[PDB]
């Protein structure tokens, strides 16, 4: 038995909001559920033990409940400032371990999109002559991220490895993304012009240069 | 209460790691100590429970050999010794502070995890360490910007103009490569009417490799 | 069409200099210039192929470039063991037939 949990809560402000964790007959219910939170980047904490009552260094702020097969983490309303991702945790006589749960981070819920700015880095003379060229190009000032980069040569677009990075948050209210793609000197050295798309879900904007200067 | 230890060097497949995090300000003999990774992306697993008395330690349905534990009265600080890593170790590894005593398989059901913190990262990669030979990256308002590439391990630090600047400096994410290197990307914005006239470089750094390279961003001739 | 070369050169240690393989009209920039050097009492190697790429093996010390007629030579520091003879080899179409200039010889002054 594998305990699940949602990959993501959308939880508005304001308003309060909870969260579910499913388990079976002898996980949940015979043993009591933990809940635990994490700060981005830090440790995690425990929130919720034995269903009733809580640590000393949380105020009157979180409730959690036990009911039969799922319990509930009731929460009430939401800070914007404080996002954190929830854990859930049980025990099973038959694993004979401690099992957690997948992870559930809570979303805040509308912002209108930018005007994405494209570059494209061509490679230096001092890569080309240990043999060897790579091509990168960068996506920045765009919001939100869930953006998809492809390479494409002005007649077909070319697959030698293309990867696309996840995007990440940065402290300017701003998404970031990038692709990279390392290529030989003879193919590298066929196409006069080269360029990357990007997806902005709705907004697709080219960037061409050429591999001369 | 107290966690905090040593980051762990990374470890290529088919080796040995040990991690130990400090205990102090208590008598180390009533509470058992855990241990558990945080996958990323995804939940925790955990392979058994350390007293720190006498050997009454058990091992998970999962974890067979592979993991091996080891405690140390004299200094306070359980010891491990980790075999057969593999592409699924790949998780930073976190000590867990328990309350009470627990020897038999149902006691700890009143048991609930105390403290966490600052645990150690361990990365699963047949690279160990190697020394970078990175390359100037010719630029394209303007864009500039250095890419690192044939280093290992994460992560390097990008500053510019001496470390003068540090406005528009984001460390781009990188990838897992099939030869198993990595490249962070950084760049910064200049106007376009300077491009080939002002000096700039950019600082990378190598901590394992002890290799700091003061390279200068030309234009593609 | 002949490839012109100093017979010697004059590099002092500690700063770069720069040499010339000059030819002739339609001689130098219609096809590729190429830099060979030989050890004395050994087989030759290559230097800079193209003026574009510095092949393996080589250390990056030497700088290869085409100026029109004149090819130059660009070198970063002088050391006592990159001491080899220097020799300029190049294409004509006029000739059929590989032209080489007279030998730079480079001394410690």
């Known amino acids: 038995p594998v305990l699940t949990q949602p990959p993501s809560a959308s939880g508005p402000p304001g308003q309060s909001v909870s969260i579910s964790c499913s388990g079976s007959?002898?996980?949940?219910?015979?043993?009591?559920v933990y809940w635990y939170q994490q700060l981005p980047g830090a440790a995690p904490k425990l929130l919720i033990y034995?269903?009733?009552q809580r640590p000393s260094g949380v105020p009157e702020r979180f409730f959690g409940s036990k009911s039969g097969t799922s319990a509930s983490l009731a929460i009430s309303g939401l800070r914007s400032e404080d996002e954190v991702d929830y854990y859930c945790?049980?025990?099973?006589?038959?694993?004979?371990?401690?099992?957690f749960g997948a992870g559930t981070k809570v979303t805040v819920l509308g912002q209108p999109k930018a005007a994405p700015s494209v570059t494209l880095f061509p490679p230096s003379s001092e890569e080309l002559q240990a043999n060897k060229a790579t091509l990168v190009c960068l996506i920045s000032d765009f919001y939100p991220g869930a953006v998809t980069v492809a390479w494409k040569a002005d007649s077909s677009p070319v697959k030698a490895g293309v990867e696309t990075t996840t995007p990440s948050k940065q402290s300017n209210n701003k998404y970031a993304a990038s692709s990279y793609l390392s290529l030989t000197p003879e193919q590298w050295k066929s196409h006069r012009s080269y360029s990357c798309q990007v997806t902005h879900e709705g907004s697709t904007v080219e960037k061409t240069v050429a591999p001369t200067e | 209460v107290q966690l905090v230890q040593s980051g762990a060097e990374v470890k290529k497949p088919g080796a040995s790691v040990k991690v130990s995090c400090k205990a102090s300000?208590?008598?180390?003999?009533?509470?058992?100590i855990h241990w558990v990774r945080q996958a990323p992306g995804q939940g925790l697993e955990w392979m058994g429970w350390?007293?720190?008395?006498?050997?009454?330690?058990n091992y998970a349905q999962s974890f067979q050999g592979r993991v091996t534990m080891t405690r140390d009265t004299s200094i306070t600080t359980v010891y491990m010794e980790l075999s057969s890593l593999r592409s699924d170790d790949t998780a930073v590894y976190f000590c867990?502070?328990?309350?009470?005593?627990?020897?038999?398989?149902?006691?700890?059901?009143?048991?609930?995890?105390?403290?966490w913190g600052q645990g150690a990262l361990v990365t699963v990669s047949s690279a160990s360490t190697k020394g970078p030979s990175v390359f100037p990256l010719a630029p394209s308002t303007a864009a500039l910007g250095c890419l690192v590439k044939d280093y290992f391990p994460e992560p390097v630090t990008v500053s510019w103009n001496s470390g003068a600047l540090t406005s528009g400096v984001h460390t781009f994410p990188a990838v897992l490569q099939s030869s198993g290197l990595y490249s962070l990307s950084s760049v910064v914005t200049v106007p376009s009417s300077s491009l080939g006239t002002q000096t700039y470089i950019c600082n990378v750094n190598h901590k394992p490799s002890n290799t700091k390279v003061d390279k200068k961003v030309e234009p593609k001739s | 069409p002949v490839l012109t070369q100093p017979p010697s050169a004059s590099g002092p240690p500690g700063q770069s200099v720069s040499i010339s393989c000059?030819?002739?009209?339609?001689?130098?920039?219609?096809?590729?210039?190429?830099?060979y050097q030989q050890l004395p009492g050994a087989a030759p190697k290559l230097?800079?192929?193209?003026?574009?790429?510095?092949?393996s093996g080589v250390p990056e010390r030497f700088f290869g470039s085409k100026s029109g007629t004149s090819a130059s030579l660009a070198i970063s520091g002088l050391r006592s063991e990159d001491e080899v003879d220097?020799?300029?080899?190049?294409?004509?179409?006029?000739?059929?037939?590989?032209?080489?200039?007279?030998g730079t010889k480079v001394t410690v002054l």
């Open positions: 867990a502070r328990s309350v009470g005593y627990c020897s038999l398989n149902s006691c700890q059901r009143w048991m609930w995890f105390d403290t």
């Open positions: 300000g208590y008598i180390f003999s009533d509470y058992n």
């Open positions: 350390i007293s720190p008395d006498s050997d009454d330690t």
């Open positions: 007959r002898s996980n949940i219910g015979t043993n009591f």
């Open positions: 034995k269903n009733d």
């Open positions: 945790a049980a025990w099973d006589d038959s694993l004979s371990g401690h099992v």
